[PDB]
């Protein structure tokens, strides 16, 4: 946002970028796109009228999206033809897409330790426990 501290150098960098963005008008082939993971700390100046004003909203994916997202990062692996990616999505909530990839990568690894080629559905589920660091123990009072 802003803040003689030693941040009067990055402040010049921003105003410079702030300067040029408004310098050139639309109709040009200089379309700009900027990515931030924390939009509550950005300057309001950065997003006012002629700067990044039409702001793109990236959500944390929904359940159907997660089932798909867990597919794209699994194509290059020999996943078994019977892997109900949909069922995996249900167990995979509050998951950012990257974590949705972590299950795929973890799924392949978990198969490795077991000495298998095709990732079974179980391997994927074990990833959904090891992607979040949880350690699945067969608690006794369930039966």
């Amino acid at each position: 946002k802003r803040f003689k501290a030693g941040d009067r150098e990055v402040q010049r960098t921003m105003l410079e970028l702030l300067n040029q963005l408004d310098g050139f008008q639309p109709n040009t082939q200089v379309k700009v796109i900027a990515a931030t993971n924390r939009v509550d700390i950005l300057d309001p100046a950065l997003l006012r009228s002629g700067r990044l004003d039409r702001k793109i909203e990236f959500p944390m994916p929904n359940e159907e999206a997660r089932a798909r997202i867990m597919q794209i990062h699994s194509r290059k692996m020999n996943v078994s033809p019977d892997v109900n990616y949909e069922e995996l999505a249900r167990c995979t909530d509050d998951f950012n897409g990257a974590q949705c990839k972590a299950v795929c990568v973890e799924a392949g690894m978990i198969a490795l330790r077991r000495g298998a080629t095709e990732l079974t559905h179980e391997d994927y589920m074990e990833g959904i426990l090891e992607v979040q660091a949880k350690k699945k123990a067969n608690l006794q009072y369930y039966a």
């Binding site: 946002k1 802003r2 803040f3 501290a5 030693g6 941040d7 150098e9 990055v10 402040q11 993971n37 924390r38 700390i41 290059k76 692996m77 020999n78 950012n96 990257a98 974590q99 990839k101 972590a102 990568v105 973890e106 392949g108 690894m109 198969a111 490795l112 330790r113 080629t117 990732l119 992607v131 660091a133 350690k135």
Partner: protein
């Protein structure tokens, strides 16, 4: 009525009843102190030699020559090559702190020897590029790499077999057998962020990985990556990672990531953002180079740095289970002078919810009980006395009067 001590009063208090040696003795003590003070000053200045070589390996006649003919050359970096006509290049050189200058080579150097970006030496007067210089090998970063392999082997890390196995499949296995991770096409996690309660084996599972490395292990201090001058933190992060890509099979171990991995927050009115921009120069850097990280407090790490795009794997070092605590015990007691019989299995159930280190102090205190009383054999009775002081003595209150409820 606290009557103030009249001057008449003071004279008597200090002489009436005085032991006839009082004035003399107090004189002797006062004499000594001043005498000691003077004694030091006459000798306090102790010569601090300044690293001169033996007289044999001197060339004082030639030494006057080097100082006279040779000249100091400012070390700079070529940031661009204008190549004015391809015959008068007019290089632009950075003097680091001095300024940016458009300089030209002294005749000694070859036009083709000074390639863009390489460190170039200039002359103090005109800044003509007199000599090329080897790329920068950081004095601090270069010392960082663990040149002496830590002695702790993998057999010293007990009760964490599944956590060591999980680490060996990211830090060792994908580095010695890059064929199981290719057949299935699984991308090896290129970093693990060991977290666990303080004293569970995070840095022991770090030294252990170092003793069986076959790689170049770089021990990132955490302290050195936070420098006074702005930017010098990030400049070190690059100069470490750059020093890794140059090596083949390099492992970087950022112990105590909390130092330079705090969750971001706008505090630009202060030097904190200096450290934060050093992490953002590390987040960019991270996302054959494997990266390790240890953090007894993972919750203080930036969510960005814990995503499965940078730290693909997160190994949790939990408190050992019983079958492991009896193993953590035997690892630290293999060198103790214990009596053959000790029911270590029994000592594992008396240390419930105890870390992998407090088991160590139970073994270290056990002897100290065997040393206090001159027995050269640390018997079992000592350990229960040990587990009372190391674990129980600081575990909780949970005492008899409030423990006669459990039977």
């Amino acid at each position: 009525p606290i009557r103030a001590l009249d001057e008449g009063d003071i004279a008597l208090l200090k002489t009436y009843g005085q032991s006839t040696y009082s004035r003399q003795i107090k004189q002797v003590e006062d004499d000594i102190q001043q005498l000691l003070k003077k004694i030091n000053e006459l000798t306090g200045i102790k010569e601090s030699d300044t690293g001169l070589a033996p007289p044999a390996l001197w060339d004082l006649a030639a030494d006057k020559q080097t100082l006279q003919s040779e000249q100091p050359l400012q070390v700079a970096r070529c940031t661009k090559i204008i190549n004015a006509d391809s015959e008068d290049p007019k290089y632009i050189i950075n003097v680091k702190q001095f300024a940016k200058f458009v300089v030209d080579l002294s005749d000694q150097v070859a036009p083709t020897d000074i390639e863009e970006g390489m460190r170039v030496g200039v002359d103090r007067n005109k800044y003509q590029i007199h000599i090329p210089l080897p790329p920068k090998i950081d004095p601090t970063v270069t010392m960082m790499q663990v040149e002496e392999k830590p002695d702790v082997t993998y057999s010293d890390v007990g009760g964490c077999k599944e956590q060591i196995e999980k680490l060996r499949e990211v830090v060792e296995t994908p580095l010695l057998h890059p064929e199981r991770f290719v057949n299935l096409g699984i991308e090896p996690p290129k970093g693990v962020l060991l977290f666990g309660p303080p004293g569970t084996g995070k840095t022991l599972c770090a030294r252990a990985v170092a003793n069986r490395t076959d790689a170049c292990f770089i021990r990132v201090i955490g302290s050195e990556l936070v420098q006074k001058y702005v930017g010098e933190g990030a400049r070190m992060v690059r100069e470490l990672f750059e020093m890794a890509r140059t090596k083949k099979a390099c492992l970087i171990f950022f112990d105590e990531i909390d130092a330079i991995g705090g969750a971001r927050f706008d505090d630009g009115a202060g030097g904190d953002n200096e450290v934060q921009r050093t992490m953002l120069e590390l987040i960019n850097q991270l996302d054959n180079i494997k990266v390790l990280m240890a953090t007894n407090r993972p919750d203080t790490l930036d969510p960005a740095l814990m995503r499965p795009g940078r730290l693909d794997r997160k190994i949790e070092f939990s408190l050992p289970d019983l079958e492991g605590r009896t193993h953590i015990f035997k690892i630290h007691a293999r060198s103790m002078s214990v009596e053959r019989d000790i029911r270590f299995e029994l000592l594992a159930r008396l240390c419930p919810n105890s870390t992998g280190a407090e088991i160590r102090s139970v073994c270290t205190e056990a002897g100290m009980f065997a040393i206090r009383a001159r027995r050269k054999i640390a018997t079992e009775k000592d350990f229960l006395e040990a587990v009372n002081k190391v674990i129980k003595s600081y575990a909780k209150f949970s005492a008899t009067p409030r423990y006669m409820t459990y039977n």
